[PDB]
Curated annotation (Swiss-Prot):
Changing Q191 to A/R: Does not affect ability to activate the NLRP3 inflammasome. GO terms for biological process: apoptotic process; cellular response to lipopolysaccharide; cellular response to virus; defense response; detection of biotic stimulus; inflammatory response; innate immune response; negative regulation of acute inflammatory response. Changing A60Q: Abolished binding to small-inhibitor MCC950 and ability to activate the NLRP3 inflammasome following stimulation with nigericin. Changing Y10R: Decreased ability to activate the NLRP3 inflammasome. Induction: By activators of Toll-like receptors, such as lipoteichoic acid (LTA) (TLR2), polyinosine-polycytidylic acid (poly(I:C), a synthetic analog of dsRNA) (TLR3) and bacterial lipopolysaccharides (LPS) (TLR4), and by TNF. Up-regulated in osteoblasts after exposure to invasive, but not invasion-defective, strains of Salmonella typhimurium (at protein level). In macrophages, up-regulated by endocannabinoid anandamide/AEA. (Microbial infection) In COVID-19 patient derived macrophages, expression is induced by SARS-CoV-2 spike protein, probably via TLR2 (at protein level). Changing Q412A: Decreased interaction with HSPA8/HSC70 and NLRP3 degradation by the chaperone-mediated autophagy pathway. This is NACHT, LRR and PYD domains-containing protein 3. Changing L139P: In FCAS1 and MWS. Predominantly expressed in macrophages. Also expressed in dendritic cells, B- and T-cells (at protein level). Expressed in LPS-treated granulocytes, but not in resting cells (at protein level). Expression in monocytes is very weak (at protein level). Expressed in stratified non-keratinizing squamous epithelium, including oral, esophageal and ectocervical mucosa and in the Hassall's corpuscles in the thymus. Also, detected in the stratified epithelium covering the bladder and ureter (transitional mucosa) (at protein level). Expressed in lung epithelial cells (at protein level). GO terms for cellular component: cytoplasm; cytosol; endoplasmic reticulum; extracellular region; Golgi membrane; interphase microtubule organizing center; membrane; microtubule organizing center. The modification Phosphoserine is found at S20, S97, S127, S166. The pyrin domain (also called DAPIN domain or PYD) is involved in PYCARD/ASC-binding. The FISNA domain is a critical mediator of NLRP3 conformational during NLRP3 activation. It becomes ordered in its key regions during activation to stabilize the active NACHT conformation and mediate most interactions in the NLRP3 disk. It is found in: Cytoplasm, Cytosol; Inflammasome; Cytoplasm, Cytoskeleton, Microtubule organizing center; Golgi apparatus membrane. The gene is NLRP3.
Length: 488
């Protein structure tokens, strides 16, 4: 009762996104499978029982965390679910252990400011609680669909997997609301737990909200208009900027280009090109501690560690001066509430350095065993690890950052990637790992026509489902380089 005031105060301070949230938060396009945030839990014209599970699916960098944090902030300010929820608990999935034994009470108390919250008072009205799980796909380790028995006592300590499974399956606090944000990759794993869910999709920035971000990022009208005009000209950057992460990456590297006397230009055509242009802007140590960065990222992906302690990065070679320089470069970030944890700015950046670990000029560097774990939850699906390998393998594409890569092993990896496409396109009997459209994103990163044309011949018939202008751009490129041997 009185604790709700103390709790909303704590939430309002923690969720001010000072890495302001209201200052740079740009409206995200959400569509049901357009939706008004307050009406998310309201039953449609047809049914009368309110919706308890709502799932937000979004691509990497689309803003699932920014949306979840903006919801925490809005609610704590009395502008969202004021009459609906007494408590909103923020479960940040990357910090959650699926093996450590904890009860639902222990988990709820973790979200509180004080060491002794009134837990029995809080769980008195379970329907007045909204558990908000940000990043389901970021649960480190294997998520088993066969685990049990399910739990019905909020005080019984259970293993993390049994605890979240019982919470998601609506066994623990059955009338409590749930908001799960996930990448569509994990939707396979999640759909089996879900109990009557409302599915919502985060489509990112509109063309209008793209311009808005550029004018919010740059506090000088001349600079904001120059950066937006650059994107309006580049078909790839204009198309890619629907992802708010691409908006930030592009704006940040364009800001560094404005500090120097360089005329605004970005001739990037692939996601690899964008990431290498961004990382090249930071090369003003990044080039000395490259092997350490890539070994940290490969270990974090293969042994499932999103958050690294000071001891972990010290083991990989990154000393106090190196972590303090990478943090300033906006490559690393301080995370896990006020605890001394570190992580790459985005999961895509960890996958970019994991992909680079396999190509570095001299974890297991065998690309065969990496491809064997592709599309599996227990390793993070390896989507950008494989995509960035296609891009970085490109020999008719170099930079100072790419010159430190072994062209001896990138030619062996290039041939192992081509055998992979051949296996995946031919045997279409598999139940999702690289879809045909996903293989097109991989070939788009490759960009070299000898490879793209050789690989496109392995596809017997083009069977794709386009949804975005990105899907059109990528698939259009692949089909252009898909000409029969006898053709014409
Ligand atoms: C499930 C795997 N796959 C199946 C085929 C369709 C594909 N759809 C997308 C959409 C956007 C992005 C994406 C990109 C192109 C760049 C960035 C980055 F710039 F931020 F890196 C982030 C992204 O999420 N990827 N795939 C997903
Ligand atoms: N609505 C938004 N407004 C402004 N910036 C955003 C927004 N959504 C995402 N971002 C940018 O994208 C970056 C990563 O987004 P995030 O929410 O972590 O993505 P996801 O959780 O889907 O992987 C943030 O650091 C931020 O700069």
């Amino acid at each position: 009762k009185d604790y709700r005031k103390k709790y909303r105060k704590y939430v309002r301070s923690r969720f001010q996104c000072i890495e302001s949230l209201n200052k740079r938060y740009t409206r995200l396009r959400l569509i049901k499978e357009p939706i008004k945030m307050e009406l998310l839990f309201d039953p449609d014209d047809e049914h009368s029982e309110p919706v308890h599970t709502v799932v937000f699916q979004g691509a990497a960098g689309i803003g699932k965390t920014i949306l979840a944090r903006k919801m925490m902030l809005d609610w704590a300010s009395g502008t969202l679910y004021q009459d609906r929820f007494d408590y909103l608990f923020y479960i940040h999935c990357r910090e959650v252990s699926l093996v450590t034994q904890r009860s639902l009470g222990d988990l709820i108390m973790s979200c509180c400011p004080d060491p002794n919250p009134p837990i029995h008072k809080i769980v008195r009205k379970p329907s007045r609680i909204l558990f908000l799980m940000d990043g389901f796909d970021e649960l480190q380790g294997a998520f088993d669909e066969h685990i049990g028995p399910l739990c019905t006592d909020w005080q019984k300590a259970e293993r993390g997997d049994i605890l979240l499974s019982s919470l998601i399956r609506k066994k623990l606090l059955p009338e409590a609301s749930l908001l799960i944000t996930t990448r569509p990759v994990a939707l396979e794993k999640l759909q089996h737990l879900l109990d009557h869910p409302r599915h919502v999709e985060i489509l990112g920035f509109s063309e209008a909200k793209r311009k808005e971000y550029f004018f919010k990022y740059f506090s000088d009208e001349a600079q904001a208009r120059a950066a937006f005009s650059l994107i309006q000209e580049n078909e790839v950057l204009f198309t890619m900027c629907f992802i708010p992460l691409v908006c930030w990456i592009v704006c940040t590297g364009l800001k560094q280009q404005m500090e120097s006397g360089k005329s605004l230009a970005q001739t990037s055509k692939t996601t690899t090109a964008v990431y290498v242009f961004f990382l090249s802007s930071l090369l003003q140590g990044l080039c000395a501690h490259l092997w350490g960065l890539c070994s940290l990222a490969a270990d974090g992906i293969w042994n499932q560690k999103i958050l690294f302690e000071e001891s972990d990065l010290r083991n990989h070679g990154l000393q106090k001066a190196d972590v303090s320089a990478f943090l300033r470069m906006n490559l690393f970030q301080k995370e896990v509430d006020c605890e001394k944890f570190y992580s790459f700015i985005h999961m895509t950046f960890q996958e970019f350095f994991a992909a680079m670990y396999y190509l570095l000029e001299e974890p297991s560097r065998d690309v065969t065993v990496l491809l064997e774990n592709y599309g599996k939850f227990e390793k993070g699906y390896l989507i950008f690890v494989v995509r960035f390998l296609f891009g970085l393998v490109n020999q008719e594409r170099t930079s100072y950052l790419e010159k430190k890569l072994s062209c001896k092993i990138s030619q062996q990896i290039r041939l192992e990637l081509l055998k992979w496409i051949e296996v995946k396109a031919k045997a279409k009997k598999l139940q999702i790992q690289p879809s045909q459209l996903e293989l097109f994103y991989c070939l788009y990163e490759m960009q070299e026509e000898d490879f793209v044309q050789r690989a496109m011949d392995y596809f017997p018939k083009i069977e794709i489902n386009l949804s975005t202008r990105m899907d059109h751009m990528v698939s259009s490129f692949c089909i252009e380089n898909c000409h029969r041997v006898e053709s014409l």
